[PDB]
Design a protein around this motif. Structure first.
Motif, short mmCIF file in Angstrom:
data_model
loop_
_atom_site.label_atom_id
_atom_site.label_comp_id
_atom_site.label_asym_id
_atom_site.label_seq_id
_atom_site.Cartn_x
_atom_site.Cartn_y
_atom_site.Cartn_z
N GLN A 1 1.61 -4.08 3.20
CA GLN A 1 0.48 -4.51 4.01
C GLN A 1 -0.85 -3.96 3.48
OE1 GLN A 1 3.43 -3.21 5.18
NE2 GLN A 1 4.14 -4.39 6.87
N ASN A 2 -0.81 -2.69 3.08
CA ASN A 2 -1.99 -2.05 2.55
C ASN A 2 -2.04 -2.08 1.03
OD1 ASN A 2 -3.00 -1.30 5.19
ND2 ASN A 2 -2.04 0.72 5.05
N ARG A 3 -1.15 -2.78 0.32
CA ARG A 3 -1.12 -2.82 -1.13
C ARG A 3 -1.08 -1.46 -1.83
NH1 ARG A 3 -1.71 -8.06 0.37
NH2 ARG A 3 0.30 -7.55 1.30
N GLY A 4 -0.30 -0.51 -1.34
CA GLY A 4 -0.14 0.78 -2.02
C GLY A 4 -1.35 1.71 -1.91
N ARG A 5 -2.33 1.44 -1.05
CA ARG A 5 -3.51 2.26 -0.91
C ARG A 5 -3.53 2.83 0.49
NH1 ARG A 5 -7.81 1.01 -4.55
NH2 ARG A 5 -8.75 2.70 -3.31
N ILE A 6 -4.27 3.92 0.69
CA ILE A 6 -4.62 4.38 2.03
C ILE A 6 -6.04 3.79 2.23
CG2 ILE A 6 -5.37 6.33 3.42
CD1 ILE A 6 -3.28 8.05 1.72
N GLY B 1 -5.58 15.24 -2.60
CA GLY B 1 -4.42 14.46 -3.02
C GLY B 1 -3.59 14.22 -1.79
N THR B 2 -3.03 13.02 -1.61
CA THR B 2 -2.13 12.68 -0.50
C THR B 2 -0.88 12.01 -1.12
OG1 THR B 2 -3.98 12.10 0.94
CG2 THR B 2 -1.77 11.41 1.65
N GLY C 1 0.46 14.78 3.40
CA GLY C 1 1.60 13.97 3.04
C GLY C 1 2.27 13.40 4.26
N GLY C 2 3.14 12.45 4.09
CA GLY C 2 3.87 11.91 5.22
C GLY C 2 5.06 11.13 4.71
N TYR C 3 6.09 11.12 5.55
CA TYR C 3 7.27 10.38 5.18
C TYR C 3 7.54 9.34 6.23
CZ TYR C 3 12.32 9.50 5.06
OH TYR C 3 13.61 8.98 5.03
N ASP D 1 -6.89 7.19 -7.15
CA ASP D 1 -6.51 8.31 -8.01
C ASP D 1 -6.05 9.53 -7.23
OD1 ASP D 1 -9.60 8.29 -7.65
OD2 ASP D 1 -9.11 10.40 -7.92
N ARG D 2 -6.38 9.60 -5.95
CA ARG D 2 -5.97 10.75 -5.17
C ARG D 2 -4.72 10.45 -4.33
NH1 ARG D 2 -11.01 14.20 -2.31
NH2 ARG D 2 -12.17 14.38 -4.31
N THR D 3 -4.13 9.26 -4.45
CA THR D 3 -3.02 8.82 -3.64
C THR D 3 -1.80 8.74 -4.55
OG1 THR D 3 -4.51 7.45 -2.34
CG2 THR D 3 -2.13 6.89 -2.24
#
Length: 197
Positions: free
Chosen positions: A138-143, A127-128, A101-103, A149-151
């Motif tokens: 910039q990344n459109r809600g993805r990693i 899961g992240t 996780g990260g903030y 499904d894991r984000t």
């Protein structure tokens, strides 16, 4: 909490089943900051103290506010520090399921690390969760390179960092409810969907 080094301190002969590696926001203390201890308490409730190692990203990650303006939303030194902790989890405990996780800047560091990770370690992160993700638009809600499904991304209405800015506004500071409920629930759920060790 604010500081937890359970992976660094943890004995290899007795690996936990779940290892959570978390990165804090700009200027926060310890290696967990304001959101990390709340997720941590709740993960320890689900798997027990000996079942989960909570590891914050410290070392070279300084969480300097100025580094949000860097290409990847954080320093290269800091991507190296989280990369090295995923590689330590992988070697010390290969049967452990990982979660991350990260903030704020920690969310851009989490996304940068997971993008560069070796596919075999990355695939162990079940899961992240990202709060106030500075590269959200910039990344459109993805990693990058990591399944949707894991984000799970927690981006408040009015948190201007989710909308492609680097201005800190009051919604950016209001992630406490999420860190206390939705975000540990998602992580506990993903770990149980695949299972532990």
């Amino acid at each position: 909490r604010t500081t937890r080094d359970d992976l660094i301190n943890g004995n290899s002969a007795s690996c936990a089943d779940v290892i959570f590696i978390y990165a804090r926001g700009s200027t926060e203390t310890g290696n967990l900051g304001t959101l990390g201890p709340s997720i941590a308490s709740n993960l320890e409730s689900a798997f027990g103290k000996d079942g989960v190692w909570i590891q914050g990203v410290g070392g070279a990650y300084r969480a300097t506010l100025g580094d949000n303006a860097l290409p990847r939303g954080t320093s290269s030194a800091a991507i190296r520090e989280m990369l090295g902790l995923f590689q330590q989890a992988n070697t010390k405990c290969p049967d452990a399921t990982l979660i991350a996780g990260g903030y704020s800047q920690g969310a851009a560091l989490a996304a940068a690390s997971i993008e560069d990770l070796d596919s075999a370690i990355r695939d162990k992160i079940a899961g992240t969760v990202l709060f106030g993700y500075t590269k959200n638009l910039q990344n459109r809600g993805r990693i990058p390179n990591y399944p949707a499904d894991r984000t799970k991304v927690f981006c408040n209405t009015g948190d201007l960092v989710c909308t492609g800015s680097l201005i800190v506004a009051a919604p950016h500071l209001a992630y406490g409810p999420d860190a206390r409920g939705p975000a540990p629930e998602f992580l506990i759920e993903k770990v149980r969907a695949v299972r532990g060790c």
